[PDB]
């Protein structure tokens, strides 16, 4: 089987993406965030705390034919971010794109902080890390990904994220009209749980290639590239003006300047992030000062290649036996 969704930004900046899902018999469609930095599929529901719904479109088991409560299961989660949500878990259908899991788990929220509350595009997140981060108790959920991947054709999906356009998540299966070049493939560690690699260098601008080993996860639910605070120093150097704001929370630059290109190394390979992709506008209506979208991960604890850096290039998740990452220009 393959399954192939289309995913549209939340809004002008690209802050988030989100793809629609069809949970439950009839099928309920959610929009959700698909992040592959967590591993819980999440949704907005009835049993949300009615003050904390503010828009978003809701998931109700009992006008599903197919739910079933998960005896017992409970969750909770905190994202990187600070945000969090809770609650009880179903099994049940789940379809993106044309791929069907039976018996999947369905994180009902009870409680969800703030800033879900406040983002009305968002019903919801799709987890796909590894089903080891799952935060199902007393017994861990498996990821819609884990779940669908003996059916499919091959143990894989793909993000191809738009630059404020719509892209595609693909599961099981290479469109290999969606790139040129080819795929450089690199190793992946899954010792935290994350699609954990190592980028060969960098480059800014049309600057010399620098060559240094940077850990870090390919993840499509962070927004920015948060990268070590040497590599942040030296781009935002090239930036007349720039200049790192405590009371921002991060680098900041004249929105008067063109920003310079940003090259990572996957292997011998390269990956080319434009300079517009860096750009995330006025820090607040009508401001002058620009938020920048390349961010020291110093504060995080790990390296981030986040929206930013995955929607320059067409992403391969090979979740084989022994998981691999591919990057190709697009």
Excluded: M
Excluded at 122 to 132: P, R
Excluded at 315 to 326: C, D, E, H, I
């Amino acid at each position: 089987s393959t399954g192939s969704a289309t995913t549209t930004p939340i809004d002008s900046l690209d802050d988030a993406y989100i793809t629609p899902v069809q949970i439950g018999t009839p099928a309920q469609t959610l929009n959700l965030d698909f992040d592959t930095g967590s591993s819980d599929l999440w949704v907005f529901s009835s049993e949300t705390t009615a003050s904390e719904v503010d828009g978003q479109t809701i998931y109700t088991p009992s006008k599903s034919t197919t739910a079933k409560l998960l005896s017992g299961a409970t969750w909770s989660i905190s994202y990187g971010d600070g945000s969090s949500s809770s609650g009880d878990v179903y099994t049940d259908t789940v379809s993106v794109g044309g791929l069907t899991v039976t018996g999947q788990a369905v994180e009902s929220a009870k409680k969800v902080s703030s800033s879900f509350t406040e983002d009305s595009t968002i019903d919801g997140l799709l987890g796909l890390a590894f089903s080891t981060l799952n935060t199902v108790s007393p017994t861990q959920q498996k990821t819609f990904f884990d779940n669908a991947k003996a059916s499919l054709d091959s143990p894989v999906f793909t993000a191809d994220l738009g630059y404020h356009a719509p892209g595609t998540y693909n599961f099981g299966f290479i469109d290999t009209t969606a790139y040129t070049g080819s795929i450089t493939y690199t190793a992946v560690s899954t010792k935290q749980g994350f699609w954990e690699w190592t980028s060969t260098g960098y480059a800014v601008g049309s600057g010399t290639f620098k060559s240094t080993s940077i850990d870090g996860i390919a993840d499509t639910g962070t927004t920015l590239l948060y990268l070590p605070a040497t590599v942040v120093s030296a781009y935002w150097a090239q930036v007349s003006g720039a200049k790192s704001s405590s009371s921002v929370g991060g680098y900041v630059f004249p929105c008067s300047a063109t920003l310079p290109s940003f090259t990572f190394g996957v292997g011998s390979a390269r990956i080319v992030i434009p300079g517009d992709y860096i750009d995330f506008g006025p820090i607040s209506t009508g401001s002058s000062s620009c938020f920048g979208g390349i961010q020291s991960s110093a504060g995080i604890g790990i390296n981030i290649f986040g929206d930013v850096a995955l929607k320059a290039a067409f992403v391969v998740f090979n979740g084989a036996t022994t998981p691999t990452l591919g990057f190709a220009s697009k």
